[PDB]
Amino acid sequence: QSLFSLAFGVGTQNRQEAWLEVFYALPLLKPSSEIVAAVAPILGYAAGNQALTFTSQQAYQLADALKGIDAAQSALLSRLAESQKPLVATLLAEDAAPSSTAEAYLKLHLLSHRLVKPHAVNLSGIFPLLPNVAWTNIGAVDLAELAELQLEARLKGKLLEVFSVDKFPKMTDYVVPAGVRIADTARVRLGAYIGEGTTVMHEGFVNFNAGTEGPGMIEGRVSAGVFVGKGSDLGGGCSTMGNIVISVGEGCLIGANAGIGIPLGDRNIVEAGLYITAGTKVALLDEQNALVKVVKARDLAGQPDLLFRRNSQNGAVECKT
Amino acid sequence: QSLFSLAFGVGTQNRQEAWLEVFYALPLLKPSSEIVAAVAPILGYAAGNQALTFTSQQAYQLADALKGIDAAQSALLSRLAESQKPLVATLLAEDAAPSSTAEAYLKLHLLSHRLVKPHAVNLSGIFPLLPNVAWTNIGAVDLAELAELQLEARLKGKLLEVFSVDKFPKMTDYVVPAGVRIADTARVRLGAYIGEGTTVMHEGFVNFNAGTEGPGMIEGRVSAGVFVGKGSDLGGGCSTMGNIVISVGEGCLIGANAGIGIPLGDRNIVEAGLYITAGTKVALLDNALVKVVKARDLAGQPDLLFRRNSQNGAVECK
Amino acid sequence: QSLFSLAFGVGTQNRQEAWLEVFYALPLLKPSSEIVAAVAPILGYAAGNQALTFTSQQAYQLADALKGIDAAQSALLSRLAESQKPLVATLLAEDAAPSSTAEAYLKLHLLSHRLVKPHAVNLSGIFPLLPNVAWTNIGAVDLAELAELQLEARLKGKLLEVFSVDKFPKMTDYVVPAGVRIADTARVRLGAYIGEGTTVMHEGFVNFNAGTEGPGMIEGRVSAGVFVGKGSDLGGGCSTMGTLNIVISVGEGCLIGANAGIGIPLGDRNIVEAGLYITAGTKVALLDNALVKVVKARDLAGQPDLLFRRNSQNGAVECKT
Ligand SMILES: N[C@@H](CCCCC(=O)O)C(=O)O
Ligand SMILES: N[C@@H](CCCCC(=O)O)C(=O)O
């Protein structure tokens, strides 16, 4: 059969041979049967979704097999052959709920390389597969081995920098997609989809399985599962919640410190400082500003050309057209 | 007498021999008289609260004394003997307002190692004892020596990374306690108390003498002096203020971009986007209006829900 | 004529010889004609605003010329002569809209060194002159060369740290002015003016051409073009709007509340209540606490001793005196 994805990885492991993270230089969506046919016998792949650890020798073998079939992947495998760290090939026959750390990391790569979009890939039960880990300037480190490494650094008059303790690394450790700006890279997780023409500013944040079509200006918080359409601006310190999935249309404008608990349609505007939820009672208004009726926000969810605000004289939530 | 605390430190110093910071690998709350008796004569400790700089030779001596008494401390001292940087032993006979940089750092360590909880230790006049400093990837640097170090890095085609200019370093430089998650480590100061099962997210922040019982999900700002009870969630960009001390009960839920200027009881809920202060007039409900009272008078009571009327903008409390 | 500014720079370049950034150890506002007269012939400077790349040999020459005239600059040039990276002298005859990357960086330095204040310098068309770049712990790197560098790091079991993808580096890479505190240095761009006695906390942010007279406590977002007067406090996650109409400024002795926001310039000693966003078109209730009249905030912009709160009971936006 035709595989969903395949990628050759270099990773890091703790003393107990558990995998902490994998790096994939060139992950492949829907690889050709030519590549699979040449690779399967050397790895010992028959079927299904596998994380197959291969040796330095197999690297060279694989590298050789793919000459004539795919040069880029061949070249990569020759570099992988030389490496100091362990190697792993992950072949995914179907888009299915992951079952290894190596598969977990592949899927996150696909998102962030833009090969797929949010919600187009299965991520069920991914948390238990991502081990909590110390992200230091010398790489991934196991939390049980941390203190000792911290002590040796200090005894040499040095410091081991620890920038995150988490189950998700930051994206720019693995990839930086084209035509994008990220002010502070700590605030974008691997799995984020950052679209072409997007600026993610310092106060901006983008979680996994989330992001922007592009172009766009993100100064606020894009939660996991949320996708923002082309041309929309998210103002400083604005929020999206983490039932319904929240999404944001094309050409929208969310104000600074505002927040949305419902999916917005195309060309919507939320006023600065305004938090609107699904159960919020809103005052709907016409061409002139006249009260049509009182509905809840969820009933106006997904609709275009809305303008939400809060009356400065009387504290009423309004929604104009 | 029985000492309050003791710890053996390796630190950094500027050209003028002033101390910028101290690292304590294994700080001790209420150390046994056995340890003290073996250590005091070699250091020259008689009484009170002292920051005693000891030499590489004394390290070995101390190391040897403690064999049979306490192995872990003995082993540590042998490593300390080899070190490149200066050493300091700080012995605290009482829990009292600090009088040296070294003692200042010890107390912060106790908090962050979870040996003590917020408000259970004296931190009066700590600011003037903590010198403002450049925190770089090669360690602590004095601000007056910074530019020169910056210039040499650049001339070699390199960059000296400067991640903070502050009187408090970030916690994970010194310790990372067990069963915790910190998305961005820049946002947790040394002195923070991060309880087991807590996740501090990117937008989360925890100052010194503050933190969480654990478990909990912190996506907001926990100010100095504030302690959050077990099971509570603090939403994205929510605030606690920096009179009354603010605290947060068990099982609470603070909404995104909300804010609390009063202590919340167990199982309280503050709605998203809502800022409630001590002088805020609130509408108490049974959802029939019972009366109108000030938020300070509702302080510390359980099972509340603070929200605002979307039709008329009235602050309520069902 | 008398020059506006001059500075000798060490920078970094990509493979195509385009300049990614410049570092200026000691930039000079209004340098004396003595310094100019000694430097101009060796560099080939006649007139106008020039970015002149000079060689390691010229460095020594320049270094020698300035002995007796200016020791500090002489000393610096002798160190620059030894350097591994390329050198550039930027001489600015007038305060004018920039025309090179090197001039762009010089002007940012002047702000951040405090030699000039926000709005006192021409920054028109600066964006296209600042190339988007990967800021890593080994320096500036071109985005087109990134992936390869990332790969080599990983093959050696290491990690290349990438802390920002942006057209502006963070300030503390170039300077840290005296008597200041910056909790998180990622949140202050080069060009920011941080005044003496200021504390910029973790949630605080200061963009280019922006900042504080000093002293002050900044726990919120100071947008580009915004200047905050002496003694003011900006509370946690508070906002100021962007010019990118009126320029927003903040007076002396003001107090902005946590999560609040200002879309108008505040006068001296103004107070904005926590959680309150006030814009130019916001209808406000002016008070004496008896209602005097109802005006639009823009009519109260730049005036002192106000108190903008929000009535808890009926949500009316008030302004007491
Ligand atoms: N409910 C929120 C916050 C949880 C993120 C924590 C995590 O994924 O580690 C959201 O969906 O963003
Ligand atoms: N709205 C913010 C930042 C705009 C984007 C910054 C940039 O593009 O460099 C301000 O005006 O301060």
Residue numbers in the entry:
A (entry chain C): 3 to 244, 251 to 329
B (entry chain B): 3 to 244, 251 to 294, 297 to 328
C (entry chain A): 3 to 246, 251 to 294, 297 to 329
Excerpt from the paper describing this PDB structure:
Pseudomonas aeruginosa is an opportunistic pathogen that causes persistent infections in humans. Randomized transposon mutagenesis screens had indicated several genes from the diaminopimelate (DAP) biosynthetic pathway to lysine in P. aeruginosa as essential, suggesting the corresponding gene products as potential targets for new antibacterial drugs. Dihydrodipicolinate synthase (DapA) catalyzes the first committed step of the DAP pathway, the condensation of L-aspartate-semialdehyde and pyruvate to 4-hydroxy-2,3,4,5-tetrahydro-L,L-dipicolinic acid, which is non-enzymatically dehydrated to yield L-2,3-diydrodipicolinate. Tetrahydrodipicolinate N-succinyltransferase (DapD) catalyses the transfer of the succinyl moiety of succinyl-CoA to the α-amino group of tetrahydrodipicolinate, the first committed step in the succinylase branch of the DAP biosynthesis pathway present in most Gram-negative bacteria and mycobacteria.
The reaction is stereospecific with respect to the amino donor substrate, i.e. only L-2 aminopimelate was accepted as substrate with a KM of 7.0 mM and a Vmax of 105 µmol/min. In three of the subunits (chains A, D and E) the binding mode of the substrate is very similar to those seen with its stereoisomer, D-2-aminopimelate. The ε-carboxyl group of L-2AP forms salt bridges with the guanidinium groups of residues Arg18 and Arg19 and the α-carboxylate of L-2AP forms hydrogen bonds to the side chain of Asn209 and the main chain amino group of Ala226.
